Subunit: 244 residues, 7 copies
């Protein structure tokens, strides 16, 4: 299972039921991206002695950035499941949250957890920019701590917030590649000819400029157990205005 924590005052409490792990394979990122992040984070988890020998704070931060519906929240959920880590949901835009409380919350994060700061562009007894920077990477910051940040708008982030030592790895999570379309078709319609996934991908890339994995999921939801339906109705993915 994957345990979710939320902040209640200065302490972390479980949020609802332990959740079924989303399998990492059920999230289709651009080719090699999932492997690169998993390798990076396993190398961090496996090498505390390398950090302590060199006097380096034993912490790592990740930033996933890009358009809505491309896999940021889903990937972090699946990654937590893959690493048997829990997730601490830390809201930076919150009445009770002070610099003092943030420092304490980061210091008492359950072990084997990812601290998740969603939509960190929207932050900027209340939090200050300097409080956030010094909690993430300052004199009092604690060790064995992994932080994930997300944003739709990396251009809005102050460079100081995401410099190495606060964010160690930045990854763009984008609209579907050819490879993501064939991989997603094969996951939703297992045991079809690879040639049929190819047919689907070629035609989607000709009917669209940009398509999110969320749109691809939503389309396959209209053709449950109907792979030929999925391949025949691709013109419906051509963008269409709202009614005015």
């Amino acid at each position: 299972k994957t345990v979710m924590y939320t902040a209640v005052g200065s302490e972390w409490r479980t949020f609802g039921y332990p959740r079924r792990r989303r399998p990492l394979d059920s999230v289709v990122l651009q080719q090699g991206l999932a492997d690169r992040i998993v390798k990076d984070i396993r190398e961090f988890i496996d090498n505390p002695k390398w950090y302590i020998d060199r006097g380096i704070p034993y912490r790592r931060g990740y930033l996933l950035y890009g358009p809505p519906g491309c896999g940021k929240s889903s990937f972090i959920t699946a990654l937590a499941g893959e690493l048997e880590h829990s997730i601490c949901l830390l809201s930076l835009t919150d009445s009770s949250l002070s610099d003092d409380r943030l420092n304490h919350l980061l210091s008492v994060a359950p072990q084997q957890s990812l601290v998740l700061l969603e939509d960190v562009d929207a932050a900027f007894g209340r939090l200050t920019f300097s409080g956030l920077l010094n909690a993430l990477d300052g004199v009092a910051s604690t060790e064995a701590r992994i932080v994930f940040m997300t944003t739709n708008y990396i251009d809005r982030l102050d460079p100081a917030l995401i410099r190495p030592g606060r964010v160690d790895l930045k990854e763009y999570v984008g609209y579907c590649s050819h490879w993501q379309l064939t991989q997603m078709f094969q996951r939703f319609y297992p045991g079809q000819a690879p040639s049929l996934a190819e047919n689907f991908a070629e035609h989607v890339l000709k009917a669209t400029s940009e398509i999110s994995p969320a749109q691809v999921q939503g389309y396959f939801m209209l053709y449950k157990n109907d792979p030929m339906g999925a391949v025949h109705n691709i013109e419906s993915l051509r963008p269409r205005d709202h009614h005015h």
Copy 2:
């Protein structure tokens, strides 16, 4: 069968007044095929949890009804709830007590077999933040077996991220009367008249008006109770008239 309304008191849902008489689905006249398409979609969602769990997809669905005042959004959602024997949870996003924390908890403890209703979601944009809403609707901590309905008169005011697939799965325009809605409404208000008389009413209404809401048609029929010939003879009164 009745329809139970819930409102939020703190972090919990409480019944709001009496159980209400179900509005029959047939008493709401949407554009041809629209009601059937939404009922089919939502029954397919309710009937297929295993399809979602097998593929690791969050078992949640969101609906947006958009369009001008008086065209059937609130009445359809009431009737739909009745058809599916679902209750309705009335969630006001513009509300002093509602924080990101409370919204997360309220969505997590929604009565089973309920539609969470967010009316006028354009008017939303401690207290609630835009990121808190997006992450409650589709984020790491969002709960399963959850159906959300949103409405707006102004879809052009909504941020794309709020209504992307995975937050909103189906968007439907609910507009001014078609020819078909006029004949269907005439036959419901004046049962056992010749179809030719409903036709006469529809043709003449569409020549006297550029746009007419179902609410206006209802209001007109209210002046001609049990007087179908009255309704057919006084259509020039629907030609728009200034306030004094």
Copy 3:
């Protein structure tokens, strides 16, 4: 009598004494207007089955709009008396009133009452969407009659007063010839109709617009003096403040 209720928190409480009913006849609207509103509201009260058979929310809303002093508040008082209804005074500009409280207040309105929203233009704590959804939304209750007033209908959002929120909109204006003769005959009973005619003709020549409130105020200067009223009409010709 007519009972007035005001909101205390989420509940309705009586306001002062039960009031003497104002007779409907003592409020003089434009010819046919009062009869049309009474007929409409009695048809609503008498026809719940017509609504339920067709699946229509059993609710009706009224908007009276127009210049100060022409009969909106007085008519609603008299109408309540005529229908043996009470009145619930709901102030939309009020510190304690939230969307939640408004919903609950409309749901526990005493039966056989008119909910009165005076000066509904001045509302736009309560949100616009909260008001619209209380008046006509999923949780709105049945057997409910709402009256709205405004001096400024052009300031109202169309969504607030669309059919299903407001079912009947009526303009309440400055005196017609007919209102002037009817008012003269009520204030000076047992005079020749020709004397009411003399009064009306001369008032319409001395004035561009005159409210019933001004006509009442004028007759108050000539209590039991109908000849005084007919002789001093040039005093109604508009005169600046100093």
Copy 4:
């Protein structure tokens, strides 16, 4: 013999303010010729004729607006009028933290009987009070009967017409700078038992030395010549307007 009781609002209720006050005699306030008589006649006709109102279905309420420049008789007249009618005065401040629409409605409904409710400087008003709350308290569905309201302002042009329409304000009176008649009347009150010809001399000369003079200025001048009517008549050039240093 009789006194005038002042009430102020404490929460939703009226309480006495200090001592019962000695009545100012109506004759000690000198308004323009006929004005005091017209207001007294109007208000006595209202007090004496409840049946006329009830028979015709008309709300048994009356409102008065006194308007004009500072120091011309508005507050002093209302004090003297209250004394003449053996009425108390309820001092209602519309600019006040605690005052809501709800509290105003309740305060007007429990006003001591035989009182004038006084709204001084009603131009300066425009939880907390709203314009609609004030209009509906003064003349709306829940307004109470046997109620007399007096409003004052220095600035009638700032008042919304809806606030002072008939049924909220029934009688509007301008209270202005001294007429010839007010000058002779004031001289005769401050210097009783002088020849009318001496009051005439005073009035003619004051109107030649001044464009505008308030009764408050005339009172202030007579205060410099207590028991000295010839002094008052001889020093009128001192009333010619003079800059601040």
Copy 5:
């Protein structure tokens, strides 16, 4: 020997502020010739004539405004005047968190008898106090009798005429920079037993070295020449205005 009691507002009531103070002698405040006598005469005539007011139905109240530049004698005169009349002083701050229209009305109604209510810097005023609340407290239906109010300001042009009309303010006096007469009078008070000719020498030379000089500046100058009248007369060029270091 008499003292002067100072009161401040605590809520709706007046309380003594520190010790009873030594009376400043009226003669130790040097106003322009005749000004002090005119104010004393006016205020004694008010105190002595309640019957004249009651017979004519006139509110038994009087208000005074002293206005003009800093350091010319407004606060010191009012202190000395209070002492001369054996009156106490009520210090009423109009710019104050707790002060409402209601509280001001009550405070003016329970002012200790034989007191001057002092509103310093009344230009700076313009729940919480409103303009109408102040006007109606000073002269309105509920205002109380046997009440004397003193207002001061450096800026009379900033006062609304309604605040200072007769019946709120009955006497306005300008308190200005030193006349020739104030300079000779002040020299004779600081250096008793000197020839009038020496006070004359001082005054003539000060008026040639300065455009404007406050009594406060003259006091401050004499403080440099305690018991040294010839020093005072010899160092007058030091009163020629001199910039701050910039």
Copy 6:
């Protein structure tokens, strides 16, 4: 020792330990300035009868003004020590401080104290301008009271705040004269030839346009017991930009 008081509500309380007196001689003001202020304040303390005979409020106020680091706070500390006076630290920018509280605090100041108002330019329930003027010199002001004000910005002070009777003596406290440089050198390096102090002063005034006593102190701190070091490294006092 010198006792420091701070305001707690309407009353004065001791702040920490009694402090070692800074010797007056250890503060080097422009030639004759210290002597003129000491003479003035001793003349005030010694002459209450002169004030009472003439009816003059027995109060005196002082304003020290000028650039940062030139001796205002250190002089007032040393002066208090020389006169065996305590110091009352009155902050005018303070949430709790009302007109009422300021009046009471000035009236109950410990006897034989200087009331110190630092940075009086920065002031302009809560304090008002009129409250401050009337506390300093008004009807209820108390006697035997000495106030010191400081500012870096005398041009920002309203003339009414610092008129005679509120402020009786204004003194500018400026950048080093030749005399202050030789005096400071002789204090930091006792028992050197006057010629060496001269060498130091001449060269500092050629390398600098403006130098504060604080800068001279800071320089001598780099050359403790090294007077030749001090004389040899003067080019280091030539102004240098920040790395920006």
Copy 7:
């Protein structure tokens, strides 16, 4: 170990665990800078008598300024460890912090501690500018007190805040020199030929205009125990845009 304190009201409390000391050698500043600050601060700690004899307040202040990720927070941590000093974390942007509380907090700082004001540019019932100046260097300031300030933006600081006697030593902490690159390579890859560190430094300075030590650390983290990898992949440090 190194003990961290944070403010709780008017008093200092330990923050989590005593931390492992960062060795001073693990922080690579520009050549000679570390030695100059250590020498200065040891001279201050060792010479109270020199201060008391001359009447000089026994206090010293330090300002480290420059771009993000160049060694300000790391150096102060390591310096505290080297001097066996604790660190008091004082947040100037904080709801509860008044002028009064700041005065008291500076007066009861644990002995043998550095008071740390991070991001002092961001400060400018509640703290005022004058309150801060008078706490740092005023009549009531306490002795045996060491303050460190940092900023990314020294141009935003008012000169009065950082004048000698408030700040005694200002040091720029910048992007990597040639010397910092060879020193960092030799620390991360001990026992390699100096010639290899040289190869690394020359090539990094040709591929970059500016590189922070934080970026160098981040790069070496990709080549743990792979010095030839570090030397071969330097073109990867050439700046690269975020995906738009």
